[PDB]
Design a protein around this ligand. Structure first.
Ligand SMILES: O=c1ccn([C@H]2C[C@H](O)[C@@H](COP(=O)(O)O)O2)c(=O)[nH]1
Ligand SMILES: O=c1ccn([C@H]2C[C@H](O)[C@@H](COP(=O)(O)O)O2)c(=O)[nH]1
Ligand SMILES: O=c1ccn([C@H]2C[C@H](O)[C@@H](COP(=O)(O)O)O2)c(=O)[nH]1
Ligand SMILES: O=c1ccn([C@H]2C[C@H](O)[C@@H](COP(=O)(O)O)O2)c(=O)[nH]1
Lengths: 213, 217, 217, 214
């Protein structure tokens, strides 16, 4: 299962451990859908979230560094990112679409903003390649690359922690770009743990965009 | 996979996510096998202290053990726990009674046999009043306070590979109480079975303990 | 600053780093940044869910409590602990003996004075056997298993303000066992005494328990 | 408090607050045994020797750091810590970037002279910043306009970390195998750690420090 985000990014499921029943089982400490469904809802409305920690996912994410810097602030998880200082960086940058400026009245046409961003990316990237060819080590040359440069990482997180992620990132106050990734994460999560997801939206979700998608 | 520990405890594998290759893919940041090179990478990561890739291998265990063992176990914070509630459940007549062989190598003023008898007696008495209290109408959360530390409890433990190795370093060591050493050995066996390459690399480059290299599996 | 809990327990403040303004500094950095606004800033953070700035306030408490209380307390993983060892020290004769009032509000087949009496009996027999075992040469780590969960233990707790507020939401709640509720009240008071604005803001916008909105400090 | 060390061309590491010291570790450790300058210190060495690191968690520090984003990203990977950072989506970012000096290139035979590399990095940074300012004045949201800024832009953050976690940070960053720039900041953190917790620090170097530059 893979979901494309922004112009060249993505979120794909690598592996998963357990399902809704994993939480049920842990809550009873042992080893009827209606009996289980109801327990899941019971645990969710009373704030008993530890049972949901026994469900874990591993995602493979392709995102712009500026989205990554926000994403990595979630410490109750595991990460492994590509090493920019020990591998030639690919020519992958996030170039917003003109619809990204929609709502904002700017001095210049949104499509012009799109153009200026591409320009910087190119000059920056060329300077980079120029630096490497000259013999300047990667760890140094890449420091002139912009924040929209794409990076990839593996993310392992438990269900409780994932729900913490969505409360903060699947919300209109978060930057739009990461919101998009959050929706993708939300969808994959819903697929693997429908019961836990249903209950989350109803009693614990503090966000606002999932209640409308 | 279920292993018996002590007189009434056990270690059982509930679930597991990934294997040795999960660390390999995590380190390369590529979602796609070459034994030689994969194993070589595992050893490399273990040898240079790059433990983050191993956090992508996760286990969920179901454990039955004495409370005095759980208290030491629960000290490992990078893990998830779910234990039976004594304040929300009638506890079962199950306690750890050390075998006479447990005081072997110790000079005592009474036969090891007597120690077992003394321990078994108080336990029996303590449990007795606990029941009298329950029938009497005394709330469980209050009635169970007269129950000794050797009472058995059960929990679910979800821990990633890295954190599990750190557990082995401290518990699968002769300096840890004998009773928890037994559980760590059981953990190690299951760990060895699921991630053989990582385990071997662990023993070879990072394990700080002293028993996992003198006792098979 | 020491507060007595139960019959022989306590909550004592060992050290503290920062205060309400520590959280103010942190949050400021975000906007490249007062005075009376600082107090209003704290409410802004508390009400809109910006908890990270409070992680910069830290506490170290010295706590004496029954083991059955310590075990629930230690479940809070975002903190640091160091406790009295039952295998490295000769445990002292000190157990939690509920007062008759503890049952007040419960129909009991036997008088509260009786329940109270039965607990003491077990405690005494258990400790009795404990000393006998020790006297006989039985290692401390084994001998203590006959001791009940109402035995008092001591530990140091270092935790930040955000994690502390998390502890209060859960323990400073009538759904938690009465014994730990009492400890939570002492912790709440000390926290109120060191970070009045943060605490005040806490009860008003983020506190999810009940007892702290009816009980003072 | 007070302590401040300058790093690179425009960065720094400032000690904001500290809780406890060596004895804090001694005390915490003592509790286990229900329990002298000579003995207390011998204990700290004992704890380090055998790896009993829990006691050092009762020593906490609060730092104020100003460093380029590429260094900060590496830094934020340390999870047992608290952070608060300058927001690129909430404030107009200043014209401050890490410009490697010519000597940073020493040891490397490069086509164009080091001075030149410095020049070219300065130029690209200048164009990127001007485009950033241009889009800002044009009404483009800050969170969107700052995406054209290079990774050598300076950021600022507060860092609250305990001594054990701090020794963990040094084993990885206080090492020649880590980028030079992170090494410099790591060396600064170590200096302050040393000043405030001599015994713990000195024992660290002797029985646990897995690095090679301290
Ligand atoms: O020395 C290093 C190199 C890499 N990374 C992690 C930091 C980033 O999260 C990601 C990209 O690193 P760079 O190689 O580009 O610095 O990998 C580190 O923590 N330390
Ligand atoms: O109110 C409660 C009940 C249970 N537990 C956790 C504590 C122990 O780790 C385990 C068993 O607790 P008891 O119910 O026996 O106290 O579950 C708590 O933290 N708080
Ligand atoms: O080998 C040991 C000794 C102590 N402790 C921690 C466990 C408890 O939190 C407290 C008291 O332990 P006991 O010595 O009573 O087991 O210290 C351990 O985890 N392992
Ligand atoms: O919505 C936000 C804003 C800030 N930050 C954290 C991310 C960085 O560590 C630092 C600055 O982020 P930017 O505002 O530049 O994205 O604060 C987030 O995680 N999410």
């Amino acid at each position: 299962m893979k979901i494309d985000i922004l112009d060249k990014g993505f979120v794909e499921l690598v592996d998963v451990m357990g399902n809704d029943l994993s939480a049920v089982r842990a809550a009873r400490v042992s080893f009827d859908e209606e009996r289980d469904r109801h327990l899941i809802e019971y645990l969710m409305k009373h704030g008993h979230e530890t049972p949901f920690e026994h469900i874990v996912f591993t995602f493979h994410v392709k995102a712009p560094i500026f989205v990554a810097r926000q994403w990595f602030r979630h410490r109750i998880a595991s990460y492994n990112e590509l090493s920019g200082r020990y591998s030639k960086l690919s020519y992958e940058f996030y170039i917003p679409s003109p619809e990204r400026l929609e709502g904002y009245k700017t001095t210049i046409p949104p499509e012009r903003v799109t153009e200026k961003i591409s320009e910087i990316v190119d000059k920056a990237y060329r300077t980079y390649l120029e630096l490497i060819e000259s013999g300047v080590p990667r760890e140094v040359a890449r420091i002139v690359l912009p924040l929209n440069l794409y990076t990839r990482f593996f993310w392992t997180v438990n269900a409780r922690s994932l729900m913490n992620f969505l409360n903060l990132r699947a919300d209109s106050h978060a930057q739009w770009e990461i919101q998009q990734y959050a929706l993708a994460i939300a969808r994959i999560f819903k697929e693997k743990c429908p019961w836990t997801f249903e209950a989350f939206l109803k009693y614990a979700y503090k966000g606002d965009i999932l209640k409308e998608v």
